[PDB]
Design a protein around this ligand. Structure first.
Ligand SMILES: *Cc1ccc([N+](=O)[O-])c(N2CCOCC2)c1
Ligand SMILES: *Cc1ccc([N+](=O)[O-])c(N2CCOCC2)c1
Lengths: 227, 9, 227, 9
């Protein structure tokens, strides 16, 4: 995308979202990141939406194929599951590479730095979902380390109702429950996050209240499933 | 369980 | 896909359908066609499902972008609509090329020949949806000619309740209404098709009755919208 | 209006 203007890449990413062309959207946003400038709040959201949709389709396909493969146990199911898995890993490596070159190092404000470190935790988490063995251990630790740095910043620099802080806590709790075999840590984090947000809702406008309570309901939904 | 859906801007 | 066994391509196309990986499914079925053997009934259905899903996503995206472009009237919306349009045309040309090299010429039974000629009409119809000008006229005539040959065979060789015959008539009626500016021909074809199928339902088993009445309801749904 | 949906085997 080197020959396209940054502003045109951003405009086309928004059009691709409306057209539900998420692979295109991700390619446009990768091109925008590679222009080398920092991303605004809205541009960060476009980057995240694009790749979340791409990797989300891959994860859903991998789960279907992994289930069929487990039931079977010719080479075809394993070969095709491996093909999807390699593609998924490639997308995760691409996102992680954008974060490392050079989005995180240039992110100084809490809102940008927390957002990117949460993304780093998420994409290592998606790698962990398909990893097998000792490779799994180092990938799991990379996810944990990114989430933990984001949590430390968010608790120092953001109010407990901030939607990014809430979504980080939600996703770190899912990491604990689904990846790290720590369901008690997942439940404790979700409960403490919910309760501290509740106590801060009185400070918010009607619109901010709506944004925060929407994510709080997701924390509650997980707590209901886990307890 | 459920992470941030995050599939719509 | 030249190095993969035909049977493995078919198996992987079925897995790709279950995983909702329709681009993969279409690539596997293209590879299977290019082995040079005729396709069974089930294999023809896999080919059609794969490409229908691929082109269906492209058509939906093209319609979103075309609507935005019409409302606007920078170059970005037009450029991106053109990109999607070129990709859509490439998929249609690929399908048409498989039919021409060499699926149609080897199809001697009515069920296979009608199926492929209906596909030929459909993919020329999708080309016509995005065509502008005199190119539109020849593309429209190519769709009409394919549908007409399929209709002539189907009326001679298949009962009026045959699902392929019914779906051909449904899609040719849509061609008349949406492409050829012939709504009266569309309505007449849908009505005659429905009525002649009704009168033949008494000959069918419970399972065949269900298959035929499902497509008859689609004819009725169009008639309700058009009258 | 509606053609054969045809998106499921
Ligand atoms: C990680 C996170 C937390 C909160 C929100 N949010 O309040 O919307 C998001 N969004 C990112 C952009 O797409 C929708 C989700 C993400
Ligand atoms: C063109 C046509 C007519 C009938 C049917 N059908 O009875 O299912 C189809 N199917 C093709 C395979 O995918 C589902 C639709 C197509």
């Amino acid at each position: 995308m080197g020959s396209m203007e940054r502003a045109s890449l951003i405009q086309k990413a928004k059009l691709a979202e409306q057209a539900e062309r998420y692979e295109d959207m991700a390619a446009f946003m990768k091109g925008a990141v590679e222009k080398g400038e920092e991303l605004s709040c809205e541009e960060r959201n476009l980057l995240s939406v694009a790749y979340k949709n791409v990797v989300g389709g891959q994860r859903a396909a991998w789960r279907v194929l992994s289930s069929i493969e487990q039931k079977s146990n010719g080479p075809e199911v394993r070969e095709y599951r491996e093909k999807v898995e390699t593609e998924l890993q490639g997308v995760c490596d691409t996102v992680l590479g954008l974060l490392d070159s050079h989005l995180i190092k240039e992110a100084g404000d809490a809102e940008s730095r927390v957002f990117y470190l949460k993304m780093k935790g998420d994409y290592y988490r998606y790698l962990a979902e398909v990893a097998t063995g000792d490779d799994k251990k180092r990938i799991i630790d990379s996810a944990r380390s990114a989430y933990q740095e984001a949590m430390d910043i968010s608790k120092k620099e953001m109010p407990p109702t901030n939607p990014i802080r809430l979504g980080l806590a939600l996703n770190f709790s899912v990491f604990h429950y689904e990846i790290a075999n720590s369901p008690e840590e997942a439940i404790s984090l979700a409960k403490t996050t919910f309760d501290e947000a509740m106590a801060d809702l009185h400070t918010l406008s009607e619109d901010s209240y709506k944004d925060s309570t929407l994510i709080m309901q997701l924390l509650r939904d997980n707590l209901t499933l886990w307890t | 369980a459920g992470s941030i859906p995050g599939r719509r801007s």
